[PDB]
Ligand binder design. Structure first.
Ligand SMILES: [Mg+2]
Ligand SMILES: [Mg+2]
Ligand SMILES: [Mg+2]
Ligand SMILES: [Mg+2]
Ligand SMILES: [Mg+2]
Ligand SMILES: [Mg+2]
Ligand SMILES: [Mg+2]
Ligand SMILES: [Mg+2]
Ligand SMILES: [Mg+2]
Ligand SMILES: [Mg+2]
Ligand SMILES: [Mg+2]
Ligand SMILES: [Mg+2]
Ligand SMILES: [Mg+2]
Ligand SMILES: [Mg+2]
Ligand SMILES: [Mg+2]
Ligand SMILES: [Mg+2]
Ligand SMILES: [Mg+2]
Ligand SMILES: [Mg+2]
Ligand SMILES: [Mg+2]
Ligand SMILES: [Mg+2]
Ligand SMILES: [Mg+2]
Ligand SMILES: [Mg+2]
Ligand SMILES: [Mg+2]
Ligand SMILES: [Mg+2]
Ligand SMILES: [Mg+2]
Ligand SMILES: [Mg+2]
Ligand SMILES: [Mg+2]
Ligand SMILES: [Mg+2]
Ligand SMILES: [Mg+2]
Ligand SMILES: [Mg+2]
Ligand SMILES: [Mg+2]
Ligand SMILES: [Mg+2]
Ligand SMILES: [Mg+2]
Ligand SMILES: [Mg+2]
Ligand SMILES: [Mg+2]
Ligand SMILES: [Mg+2]
Ligand SMILES: [Mg+2]
Ligand SMILES: [Mg+2]
Ligand SMILES: [Mg+2]
Ligand SMILES: [Mg+2]
Ligand SMILES: [Mg+2]
Ligand SMILES: [Mg+2]
Ligand SMILES: [Mg+2]
Ligand SMILES: [Mg+2]
Ligand SMILES: [Mg+2]
Ligand SMILES: [Mg+2]
Ligand SMILES: [Mg+2]
Ligand SMILES: [Mg+2]
Ligand SMILES: [Mg+2]
Ligand SMILES: [Mg+2]
Ligand SMILES: [Mg+2]
Ligand SMILES: [Mg+2]
Ligand SMILES: [Mg+2]
Ligand SMILES: [Mg+2]
Ligand SMILES: [Mg+2]
Ligand SMILES: [Mg+2]
Lengths: 47, 274
RNA sequence: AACGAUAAAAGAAGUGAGAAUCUUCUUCGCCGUAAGGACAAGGGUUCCUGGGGAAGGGUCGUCCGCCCAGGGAAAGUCGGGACCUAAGGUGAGGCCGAACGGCGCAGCCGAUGGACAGCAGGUCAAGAUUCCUGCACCGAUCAUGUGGAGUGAUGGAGGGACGCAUUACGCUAUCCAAUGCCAAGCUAUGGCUAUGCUGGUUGGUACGCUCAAGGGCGAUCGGGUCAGAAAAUCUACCGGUCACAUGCCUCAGACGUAUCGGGAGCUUCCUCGGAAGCGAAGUUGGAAACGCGACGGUGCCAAGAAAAGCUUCUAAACGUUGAAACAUGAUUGCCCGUACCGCAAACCGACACAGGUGUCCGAGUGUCAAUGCACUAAGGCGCGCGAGAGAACCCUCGUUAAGGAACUUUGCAAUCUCACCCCGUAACUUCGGAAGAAGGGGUCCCCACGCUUCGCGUGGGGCGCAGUGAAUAGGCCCAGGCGACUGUUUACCAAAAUCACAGCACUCUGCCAACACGAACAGUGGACGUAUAGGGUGUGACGCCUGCCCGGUGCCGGAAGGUCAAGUGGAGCGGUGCAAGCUGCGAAAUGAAGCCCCGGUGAACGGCGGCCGUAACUAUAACGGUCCUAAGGUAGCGAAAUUCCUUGUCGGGUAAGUUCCGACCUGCACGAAAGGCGUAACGAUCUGGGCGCUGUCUCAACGAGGGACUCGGUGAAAUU
RNA sequence: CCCCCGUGACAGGGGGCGGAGGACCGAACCGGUGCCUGCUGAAACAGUCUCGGAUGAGUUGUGUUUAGGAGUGAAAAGCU
RNA sequence: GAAACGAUGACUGAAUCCGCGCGGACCACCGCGCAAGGCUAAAUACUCCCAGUGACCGAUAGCGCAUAGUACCGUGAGGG
């Protein structure tokens, strides 16, 4: 049957993207929080 | 008056349709058709607000002018009577010797090819746009505005009449289709006559579908819902309320007045609607 | 245990340390509106070449979608951008808000849409509307000529500009036929010796007085300021005028000619088999699109985007011996996308998983038609364990004496029925229907005759058990309950009598409407709607109807009075100081809405009921009916989806009937929009009965296939 | 719509023609009725057979909006 | 609470030297005080980073890491 994850480049970028995350204080707060954890993958646009 | 249908499908007996044989078969004016997108009854925060709206045929808007003061003095002729989807009334096209084309609500009787004149100096015949005071008493009229030049806000849906009870102060006593009596500034324009279509009240929808074609999503009985959903929800069967008839939000329906208690307009209402 | 669909394999040959698994050959089998082909989304080197073999592969591998290396992807014309706007997202100014922030006109972003110049071929081991060949096209800049006075925006107008169903005429893609044309060779096994057999049979471009259906069509003058902010040869009005049949215009496509390709194959060389060279024919007849002519015709109501490019007109402007416009020539041509998988082993499903994934293409024969069914072409594949056995038992199937629902909770299951033609067809009804009701017949081959052909009718003849000869392919009826109906629902135990529904009623709402989302005097929905509209509530086609009770409660209305908070008013009481004074508490009268109270209100919430007497041991099946709260059941219905007593009582059907039907009325505990009683029709609803048919059964057999068993290979699990 | 037949106060009725429909049989597609299989599955919901819808209240792609006492819901406390 | 005092949201709003504000209702007296105008280092907090030390740990310990926020899981936040 049709499963949850149904890949869509533009979806992913527009939703979990760097521009997206920067558009809001809470997403900015993710960015900083992640940087802090030392993630290789700051954000989806890093893939 | 209305088109009927032999019962060749079950939902085709009761069904009826309007009489279009008097509508000049024309596409609306390219210079007068606007784009009307729909709304689910959703507002700029995205929430359903107006409840049970959706679907239905695609609609273009046809710009109308109600305040005819733009073209007062000069007169036009009736070019045609076309169909408008967003109004109960049929509408009609105007060709001025002036050269401009306009759209005005189309009153009961008024035939194609007639001429019509807006502005204070105009006869009490069908279609003329007169200030209220210049209207002979007891006349039958519609398209009444509530402020001079603001535009017709009263008597617009099919087959509706306003009957001037008669002059007074600066103002004129007016009879509203609800049966309510109102005071209206005599400087306000109006247009002579009953509204038209008029047989509109008699058409029969017939099949669920028709509701949907008119963009009306099905309407949900509270009693079917659940406690969590709505006051009338719950119980172990078909149930009768178990409390006063009440809206989703809890305020009493059936009998509870709602018009705001302290309001400016009140000293212009001479008799309540009844 | 299992090795992931029961579509299927066999031999030879090669390779190799090793082969059931790799390679080649010959066959066999399976898909063929697909299991073939082409896009999109997604994936990311998985493509090609050469090598490799630890692990990955449910066995094995010498192989691979795995591992290593190197190659491979080419665009002015296809798609995106340098153009356009939709929903939506944004958004200086501007409107709101403890903060972060929420809105928000123009403008702007935003394809899933508008716009827009290139076709036919060839070929890498791997690219192709990109490269190569052949001939076109587009804008831009310049030069030479035709120049010889206009160019026309950031504003105007035209235009772009749009629905559903149905349908006439012409054509193409494309497929069929043939003693048309062309090419090849053969004679099989009894015959054929070609009139047999196999294969092929025109794509682009240009021109052409050839053919051509269909499709597009007003012109001009003048007037009116007031319309387009203004302007205006443009647009819209009004008026005048112009030979209706049409011509004016276009040419899908056809024919012809010429030319550029392609073309069955032929040849030659040769290196687990490719390289180059060459090249025949082009018919007549028929079918035919959802494609093209096309923005066609007709009918319908629910009434079917925007903006730019485009055409037209002025404003301003610079010009008016270089203005547009044209012709030829040269020049120029950005950015990203193109490999490969792409109904799947390469995407989503932890897997090389029986699932899921949007669009286009999708041949032939047979069949009323078809994207159905059978077989098949092209193409693709035999599903990455195998071999034997031929027990129980299990799954999926074939048939089954006599009987035929005796099975069972229930005909659950399985059978019977099955397409097309003709004949024929009930109660009942809203006159549409029920209806394919029911039921009966026909169906194949040859020949002649007739007719409108692919075909059919008629007659006669023929063969078999049987002629929709195989596959696709309704079992029917009688009678209840519920819901009118098509629809909808619990992803993953309920599809229904649930919900929705058209119709009906009550009520609110006069527009900054009620109502609703909101930090909010923002903004928004309602609605660019206006009481024939909008919200909320209940009922649920249709028909006949929809009774009694306003005491309690809730709503609408009333008002003498009793009322009631802050406050207004402080009579009066105390504190302190020697005192002017400062100061603690504080009574009347007055004082809003609201409650008390009066009336109204049921398609408002609701109510329409307690009960009187029996022979004997502190007691069971049965009883006829008077009637307290505001009232105490009008119709219709009743042992009911409602009945405790209960298998009520009678009748029906049955050999026998706790179920079903009808009637009865003693309704524990029906009843009128929480609708009452009916109702044709509709139902994967529920219930009872019948006909037919059957392994459901008496009662099980025989058969088949897939497991289970045996051998070689890989080898889990819950539990303990 | 075109011809034809009927006049008790009567719609009607026949023929041509037209091509309507929450019409019908049925594939794609959408759906899940019933039985069996499956139940350490081929699969964390399926398979074969059977069945419902199949011009509509239809199915579907893309872009986008709505959310946690909140959304959304032809209403199952379903779905998020 | 007998509720002083500061503090503002609403309404209202005086004296400037014999004047003003306090001293826990309130008055007298006795005491302390110069509101409505601004800046100010030092002692104090913390520890990403650096150095020294340790009756701290030595590979299941010690940071999650003898290094990695990687592999891996999740649409994501996030986990690891
Ligand atoms: Mg309703
Ligand atoms: Mg419910
Ligand atoms: Mg509640
Ligand atoms: Mg309730
Ligand atoms: Mg085994
Ligand atoms: Mg296998
Ligand atoms: Mg096998
Ligand atoms: Mg050898
Ligand atoms: Mg094999
Ligand atoms: Mg060989
Ligand atoms: Mg395929
Ligand atoms: Mg790529
Ligand atoms: Mg292996
Ligand atoms: Mg080797
Ligand atoms: Mg490969
Ligand atoms: Mg080129
Ligand atoms: Mg915004
Ligand atoms: Mg696009
Ligand atoms: Mg193009
Ligand atoms: Mg383009
Ligand atoms: Mg045709
Ligand atoms: Mg052809
Ligand atoms: Mg022949
Ligand atoms: Mg012979
Ligand atoms: Mg623009
Ligand atoms: Mg490719
Ligand atoms: Mg899985
Ligand atoms: Mg496999
Ligand atoms: Mg698969
Ligand atoms: Mg086809
Ligand atoms: Mg076929
Ligand atoms: Mg088939
Ligand atoms: Mg083949
Ligand atoms: Mg393949
Ligand atoms: Mg038998
Ligand atoms: Mg027998
Ligand atoms: Mg029986
Ligand atoms: Mg059955
Ligand atoms: Mg009949
Ligand atoms: Mg029959
Ligand atoms: Mg015989
Ligand atoms: Mg026979
Ligand atoms: Mg069958
Ligand atoms: Mg139903
Ligand atoms: Mg149904
Ligand atoms: Mg379920
Ligand atoms: Mg079910
Ligand atoms: Mg009062
Ligand atoms: Mg009996
Ligand atoms: Mg009975
Ligand atoms: Mg009912
Ligand atoms: Mg073994
Ligand atoms: Mg239908
Ligand atoms: Mg469903
Ligand atoms: Mg104070
Ligand atoms: Mg150790």
């Amino acid at each position: 049957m049709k499963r949850t994850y149904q890949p869509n480049n533009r979806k992913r970028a527009k939703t979990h993207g760097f521009r997206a995350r920067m558009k809001t204080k809470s997403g900015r707060n993710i960015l900083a929080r992640r940087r802090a954890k030392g993630r290789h993958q700051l954000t989806v646009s890093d893939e | 008056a209305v088109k009927k249908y032999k019962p060749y499908t079950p939902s085709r007996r009761q069904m009826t349709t309007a009489d279009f044989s008097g509508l000049a078969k024309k596409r609306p004016e390219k210079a007068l058709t606007e784009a009307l997108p729909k709304t689910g009854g959703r507002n700029n925060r995205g929430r359903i607000t107006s409840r049970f709206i959706g679907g239905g045929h695609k609609r273009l808007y046809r710009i109308i002018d109600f305040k005819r003061r733009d073209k007062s003095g000069v007169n036009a002729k009736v070019a045609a009577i076309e169909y408008d989807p967003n109004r109960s009334a049929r509408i009609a096209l105007l060709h001025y010797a002036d050269g401009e084309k306009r759209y005005i609500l189309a009153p009961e009787g008024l035939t194609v090819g007639a001429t019509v004149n807006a502005g204070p100096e105009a006869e009490p015949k069908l279609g003329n746009a007169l200030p209220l005071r210049f209207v002979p008493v007891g006349a039958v009229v519609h398209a009444l505005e509530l402020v001079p030049g603001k535009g017709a806000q009263l008597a617009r849906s099919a087959g509706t009449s306003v009957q001037v009870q008669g002059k007074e102060s600066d103002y004129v006593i007016v009879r509203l289709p609800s049966g309510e009596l109102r005071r209206v500034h005599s400087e306000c324009y109006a247009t002579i006559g009953a509204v038209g279509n008029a047989e509109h009240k008699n058409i029969v929808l017939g099949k669920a579908g028709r509701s949907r074609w008119l963009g009306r999503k099905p309407h949900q009985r509270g009693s079917a819902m659940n406690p969590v959903d709505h006051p009338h929800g719950g119980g172990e069967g078909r149930t009768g309320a178990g409390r006063v008839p009440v809206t989703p939000w809890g305020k009493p329906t059936k009998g509870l007045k709602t018009r705001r208690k302290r309001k400016t307009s009140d000293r212009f209402l001479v008799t309540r609607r009844k």
